[PDB]
């Protein structure tokens, strides 16, 4: 896991975020109103990074891009799109060296599991297991380059929310908007699976988020990351099968900068139009 410090090159790209990232503030029902409130959000048009690290079998000559450091910054955005369900969990914390509890997520397989263990680093004890059609349960082998820790607390298991929907050779179908928020009451999570036909262009349609889970924790988070580097080993070096080869990840991200929004619930109970206040003088007037 972590990385093989293969920091070949870092091209920073900036993209204009269109109308995106509107979520339900509180679990109260309303309909056909124009209630306005202030809360943690991200601006309607804010430049965000486009971390072009999707090296599905390399970009050009196994041109793989790493993602070692990513600071939390009081709240985080996330998005990605890919046919292969290579996306696997997120990591949060400040030091990530058995000094602060780190949020580790394992998806797919049997069921999604979330842990806040105080482990030293990514253990990867069984992250490569019974994959493809090896169809033999040796269980003797283990992931090589790094060891495993033991300290753990607050194990949580549920149905895998990292849903691949229908993984098929379609035009473009998968867009996950896993939004993570940190407050004292509980670490809050939102998601929205949307099919969009553009891969480079972030969709301009107006979708909304829905709450997922209410896990109570009050630990400090300063940096985030995601490790798709499980099964990165070639299995047998002659075999040369790391899934397909190595991995790939989009992890299109951004930061919040809270503000005051005006949300208009529709007749049925969903969000049809939201408007900012400080975006422009016209926004202030609205």
């Amino acid at each position, epitope marked *: 896991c972590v990385n093989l410090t293969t920091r070949t090159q870092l091209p920073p790209a900036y993209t204009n975020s269109f109308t995106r990232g509107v979520y339900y503030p509180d679990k109260v029902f309303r309909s056909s109103v124009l209630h306005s409130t202030q809360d943690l959000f991200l601006p309607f048009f804010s430049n965000v990074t486009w971390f072009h690290a999707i090296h*599905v*079998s*390399g970009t*050009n*000559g*196994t041109k793989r891009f790493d993602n070692p450091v990513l600071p939390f910054n009081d709240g985080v955005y996330f998005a990605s799109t890919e*046919k*292969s*369900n290579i996306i696997r969990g997120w990591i949060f914390g400040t030091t990530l060296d058995s000094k602060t509890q780190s949020l580790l997520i394992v998806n*797919n*397989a049997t069921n999604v599991v979330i842990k806040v263990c105080e482990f030293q680093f990514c253990n990867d004890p069984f992250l490569g297991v019974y*994959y*493809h*059609k090896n169809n033999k349960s040796w269980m003797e082998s283990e992931f090589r380059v790094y060891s495993s820790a033991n300290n753990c607390t607050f194990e949580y298991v549920s149905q895998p929310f990292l849903m*691949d929907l229908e*993984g098929k*050779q*379609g035009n473009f179908k998968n867009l996950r908007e896993f939004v993570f928020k940190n407050i004292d009451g509980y670490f809050k999570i939102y998601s929205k699976h949307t099919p969009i036909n553009l891969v480079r262009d972030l969709p301009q349609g107006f979708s909304a988020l829905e709450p997922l889970v209410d896990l109570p924790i009050g630990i400090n988070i300063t940096r985030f990351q995601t490790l798709l580097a499980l099964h990165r080993s070639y*299995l047998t070096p002659g*075999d*040369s*099968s790391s*899934g*397909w*080869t190595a991995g790939a990840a989009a992890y299109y991200v951004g930061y919040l900068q809270p503000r005051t929004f005006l949300l208009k619930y529709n007749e049925n109970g969903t969000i049809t139009d939201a408007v900012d206040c400080a975006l422009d003088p016209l926004s202030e007037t609205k």
Partner: antibody
Amino acid sequence: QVQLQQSGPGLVKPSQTLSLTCTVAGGSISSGTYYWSWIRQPAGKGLEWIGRIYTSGSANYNPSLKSRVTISVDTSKNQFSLRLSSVTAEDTAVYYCAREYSSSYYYFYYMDVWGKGTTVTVSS
Amino acid sequence: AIRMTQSPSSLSASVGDRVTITCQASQDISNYLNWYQQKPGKAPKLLIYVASNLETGVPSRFSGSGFGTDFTFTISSLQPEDIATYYCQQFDNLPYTFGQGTKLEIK
């Protein structure tokens, strides 16, 4: 030892509907693990995949032929069928039926068992 | 559609030599490459579903390597029974498209 055996007419007049059927043995087609496909190969030419159908009923075809081809499944009798309309001189080929198997954790896709094929000729 | 181009369309070789055939896809297909065998007068038979492993009943002499868009299939020691046509096939695009084929002959 699942084997697939084909029943066809062998000959179809021009501008008539070709009907083929592939009988699956060694197991029921109602298993959700397989995709059942028709493929064809013209005499002396390469292989061209025609289409698949998932066991649930969902079907997919090569776009160049989507309008004229129809693949159906009958799990209650463990066969699946092909109907190709507006047969032309290029429709003469050997037609194979085959099972595809795939996993979700790793979306690799491959044809692990094939049928024997059936020669379709389009002549008056 | 995705176009697949193999370096040899036909070849003649002798018993015991190592033969290598390449396949190149029009754009990056990761490792979504399958290998088929067409015996004279026989039905198509899957040989290499994934380069890493060999399908049941496939002779051990068949192996695969390569990356990105270019992939290699090797037979470490050709035998007379290996006379056949080998096709590579991507499944990155929606159609399960196949290559043009490489006829491997035995001297």
